Design a protein around this ligand. Structure first.
Ligand SMILES: *[C@@H]1O[C@H](CO)[C@@H](O[C@@H]2O[C@H](CO)[C@@H](O)[C@H](O)[C@H]2NC(C)=O)[C@H](O)[C@H]1NC(C)=O
Ligand SMILES: *[C@@H]1O[C@H](CO)[C@@H](O)[C@H](O)[C@H]1NC(C)=O
Lengths: 79, 45
């Protein structure tokens, strides 16, 4: 019973759970959308992107503010 | 006026790239795998 509960809560199928997989080189890939909340990169964490691809940092009806102390770079919907 | 007479002769008066290197940003190389044949083995035993 508890093994079925473990199988079902992570929603594991014959291929595996519909969340992620561990690529054998260590590359933690994911499979769908992610809501990471706050993020605090500590050590050697350069937010990049895939080759021949464009980072698309969009705020869905929300501003984007690059802040540092007083300095602000605010990209709102119309300013 | 002879006082402001000026003489001049010849003399010898003789007085772009862009590049930045980051460290790394490689993507998911060798993007292919499957989880059926091993699943078939471990569910066929
Ligand atoms: C961006 O658009 C919003 C929504 O229209 C603006 O907010 C209000 O817009 C109305 C009509 O455009 C104005 O009458 C109000 O005075 C605005 N309120 C405020 C608090 O600004 C907003 O002003 C726009 N931003 C820019 C820079 O134009
Ligand atoms: C040359 O002319 C200026 C302007 O009038 C004058 O002040 C100056 O004394 C002149 N120089 C000489 C050597 O006279």
């Amino acid at each position: 019973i508890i093994t079925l509960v473990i199988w079902a809560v992570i929603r594991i199928g014959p291929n595996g759970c519909d969340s992620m997989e561990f690529h054998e080189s260590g590359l933690l890939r994911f499979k769908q959308v992610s809501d990471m909340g706050v993020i605090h990169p500590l050590y050697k964490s350069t937010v990049g992107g895939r080759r021949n691809e464009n980072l698309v940092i969009t705020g869905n009806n929300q501003p984007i503010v690059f802040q540092q102390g007083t300095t602000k770079l605010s990209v709102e919907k119309n300013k | 006026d002879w006082c402001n007479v000026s003489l001049v002769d010849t003399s010898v008066p003789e007085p772009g790239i862009l590049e930045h290197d980051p460290f790394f940003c490689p993507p998911t190389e060798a993007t292919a795998r499957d989880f059926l044949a091993d699943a078939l083995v471990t569910l066929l035993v």
